[PDB]
């Protein structure tokens, strides 16, 4: 009942009382970032609760989120919590553990250098007039705009081509039997009943396992599975059309100190990348339409500032992205008001103390980046859009423990870069092309959904007109 | 359904063909002794099984044991075989894993010093001659004895007062509290009904843990708790009458590299110590004393090597007992015929290959010491209880990873001398009063149970004379 609750009453640590069996999920109606924003207010920087009889311990210290992401990242502080029923797709990097998880990530830091990500930008320009096509189609009709489908079909586009060289206009194919099954790979709400109730019962786990349910819909990864060797198999025949995806990249892998990617592994990272990627990619895409919808001076500065590295909409190239100083600043400052992936987690594997404090066995860490990110001892008007804050005259002064759209450690974003360089090619595509301006129905100011997942409460909806 | 079926298969490894869900857990019905000898005989020097979904892969070969047990001990074979629900009795050193169990060992060892058992000495022996005026008592009275009574009786007399200082003639005092309790504390028939069903229904185990399900029984280990508890604080108190039990010697490591014993795992040593060495000593005694009154030759020697070293009924004592060859002769003898922990095992935690077979992680490492002390490779005439085996000239042949009734490398058992010199100072001072002849009801030739636990079929009931 209360079995695990006397753990921060013992320890000294703050934080909001326990119910018994639930924890303090009950909490959690505002959903996690008005949470965690709450407990820091009140408790200051460190405090803890509990999911259900699993004790959480926030941290907000950047030397000590140093300690936990970085310094003792492979000694201690390795794996994210566990959720489940995973079924295989356990051998997926973002879900692995410990060996495997370092085994992993040696095997797949190739397929996202610098190098190979050049090489995959002539494929996601081709989506970025792709998606410019369906904008002006929507343009030429005066009508409103729902962002999150333009985007949304966007970043499926540049998802089914660079991972399995796939080519579609997701947006006027919807029923492709690879569009139809791609759209299913969402995120997770935790807040939901199925993960809340798991939460409480975390024992029913195995039972759920045993009987192959899986979070990961069973129709979607068996078509992709079979999509897959379908694909390995016709590669290695017409073996003259030389590929850029990652599915490419994995299969040169295996023509190999560690073990190669086994062929279930690679179905597993072919799965986990597409999920990481899709409903994110578009997501942060929408919140950045938004804020220049809002704020059209920053809207004009950044069109600007393309015409002046892209005179006469010349295609953007992976050099001229890197270039463009403003558009980078935008599309951080917007990462720092939405940081969607709400926290960053590892689980404390060994009795430890870092940077003074003890932290018991078993301990799920948690780094509150939304609240750290809106915080008003590193943040001046946190809750305005001023992408000035990162200039590179201000750029001194940002913490990278604070400031962790992408976490940070030998466990961040692997798809940084590449998830990067994909907003900015969608980003200066469109703008070259269009201006953005709100609706009537236009929510403004945009309010976050209660639940668990970051993402605006109504859609976002705004006017596009062409240049 | 057959999930985990095909481990065995794939690496070309024989063995009996499972059934969906049940493994070959229906290949229990003539129990694991003579599961494993048809294994042997059959499939060779290694072979694998289910147990349920759990792979099990026995092996034969010394130098192969040597690795398992020895050599990669620390770095792959540390733990036993996952068994529950064991609520608090996880941190037990027999149930403890890795880093707990490194650490536990270590605070305990010097607990089992021959320094500390010479100690206690003088403390058995005084329930040697509890047990001789209570055989007396049966002895005078014509009348059939049962050995496991009064073993036990003498078993328990010897675990009260050298764990507890608890001093009890528990053969007469059979209602007492601290009697009825510990008599409860029996070794785990696996082949039970409750058991078997954990084995088919694993994922069951989390459901038992999260209502307070224990294997080891709540009133018991309740009891125990609260009654050192008790001795705990009565013994700061009256400080000057020393002690030279268990509890005692564990009381003064937590007076302390590693961290002192917390109270709750003192009590957890406690109670697997009794469990530990409680049925076992007294089903090897009565192992012991059949083979004596079956080989009444083997008896009249033993009994002269004792009134040799001890003359005119002398004391025995620990140099004394140490000195008679003979007496640890019948001893290990009896030990081969009888190993009662049946099998060892350990986890294997990491994919390695040791001396040239691969074996993947989570399979359960089997070494089959009943089979092994059977085995006609090793031993000539197996089945024939004869001493002479074990003698000087002879115990140059016997391989220490064939003859393990107690284990070997790290993990071994740490109550082995105790258990040794225990059983033998009873043998000693019963020995040198009384003579052990068979009945008509004495089971000859005695039938072992087709149960989980080595034990005979029928209890073993002797007649008992007076010298
Ligand atoms: C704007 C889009 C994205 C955002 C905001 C984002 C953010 C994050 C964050 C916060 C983490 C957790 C890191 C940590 O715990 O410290 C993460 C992990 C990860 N991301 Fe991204 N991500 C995005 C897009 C992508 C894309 C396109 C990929 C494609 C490969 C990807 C692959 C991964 C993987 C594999 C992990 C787990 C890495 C590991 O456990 O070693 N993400 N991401
Ligand atoms: C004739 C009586 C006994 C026999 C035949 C016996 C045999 C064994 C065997 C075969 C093991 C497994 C070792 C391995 O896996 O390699 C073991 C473990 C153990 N035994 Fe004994 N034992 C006896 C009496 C005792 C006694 C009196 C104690 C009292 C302390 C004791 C304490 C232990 C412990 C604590 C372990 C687990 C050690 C660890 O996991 O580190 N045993 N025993
Ligand atoms: C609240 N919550 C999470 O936030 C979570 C989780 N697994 C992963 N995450 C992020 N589980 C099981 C959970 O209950
Ligand atoms: C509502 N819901 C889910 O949300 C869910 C699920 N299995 C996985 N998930 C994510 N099941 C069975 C379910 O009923
Ligand atoms: C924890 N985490 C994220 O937070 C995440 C992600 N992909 C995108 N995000 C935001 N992956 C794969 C992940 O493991
Ligand atoms: C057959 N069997 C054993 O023999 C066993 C066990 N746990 C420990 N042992 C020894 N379990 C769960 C088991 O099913
Ligand atoms: C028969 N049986 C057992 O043998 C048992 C048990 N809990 C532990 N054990 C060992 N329960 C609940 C049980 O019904
Ligand atoms: C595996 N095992 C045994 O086989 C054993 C024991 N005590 C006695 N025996 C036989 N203990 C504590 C143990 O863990």
Not at 207 to 216: K, P, Q, S, T
Not at 355 to 364: H, L, T
């Amino acid at each position: 009942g209360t079995h695990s609750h006397g753990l921060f009453k013992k320890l000294g640590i703050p934080g909001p009382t326990p119910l018994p069996f639930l924890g303090n999920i009950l909490s959690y109606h505002k959903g996690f970032c008005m949470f965690d924003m709450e407990c820091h207010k009140k408790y200051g920087k460190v405090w803890g609760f509990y999911d259900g009889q699993q004790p959480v311990l926030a941290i907000t210290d950047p030397d000590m989120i140093k300690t936990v992401l970085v310094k003792e990242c492979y000694s201690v502080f390795t794996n994210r919590r566990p959720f489940g029923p995973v079924g295989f797709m356990k051998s997926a990097i973002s879900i692995a553990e410990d060996e495997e998880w370092k085994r992993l990530r040696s095997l797949l830091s190739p397929t996202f250098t610098s190098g190979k990500l050049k090489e995959m930008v002539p494929i996601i320009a081709q989506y970025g007039d792709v998606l410019v096509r369906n904008l002006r189609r929507e343009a030429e009709t005066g009508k409103p705009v729902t962002l999150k489908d333009v985007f949304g079909a966007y970043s499926m586009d540049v998802i089914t081509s660079t991972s399995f060289g796939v080519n579609i206009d997701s947006l006027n194919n919807p029923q492709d039997p690879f569009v139809e099954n791609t759209k299913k790979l969402l995120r997770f709400d935790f807040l939901d009943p199925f993960f809340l109730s798991i939460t409480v019962f975390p024992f029913l786990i195995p039972i759920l396992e045993v009987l192959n349910i899986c979070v990961f819909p069973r129709e979607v990864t068996n078509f992709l599975r079979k999509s897959v060797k379908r694909m390995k198999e016709s590669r290695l025949e017409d073996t003259q059309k030389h590929r850029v995806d990652f599915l490419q990249l994995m299969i040169d892998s295996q023509n190999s100190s560690h073990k190669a990617l086994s062929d279930l592994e690679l179905v597993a990272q072919s799965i986990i990348f597409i999920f990481a990627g899709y409903e994110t990619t578009s997501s942060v895409l929408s919140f950045i339409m938004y804020e220049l919808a809002t704020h059209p001076d920053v809207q004009q500065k950044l069109q600007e500032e393309i015409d002046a590295v892209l005179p006469n909409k010349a295609p953007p190239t992976y050099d001229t992205v890197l270039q463009m100083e403003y558009l980078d600043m935008v599309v951080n400052e917007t990462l720092r008001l939405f940081p969607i992936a709400m926290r960053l987690e590892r689980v404390c594997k060994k009795d430890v103390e870092i940077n003074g404090m003890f932290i018991p066995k078993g301990v799920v860490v948690m780094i509150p980046s939304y609240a750290l990110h809106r915080d008003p001892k590193y943040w001046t008007e946190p809750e305005k859009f001023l992408p000035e804050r990162f200039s590179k005259k201000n750029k001194d002064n940002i913490d990278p423990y604070i400031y962790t759209p992408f976490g940070s450690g030998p466990r961040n974003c692997i798809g940084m870069r590449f998830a990067l360089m994909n907003m900015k090619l969608a980003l200066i595509r469109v703008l070259q092309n269009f201006s953005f301006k709100p609706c009537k129905e236009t929510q403004i100011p945009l309010k976050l959904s209660l639940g668990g997942l970051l993402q605006p409460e109504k859609p976002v909806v705004l006017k596009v007109e062409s240049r």
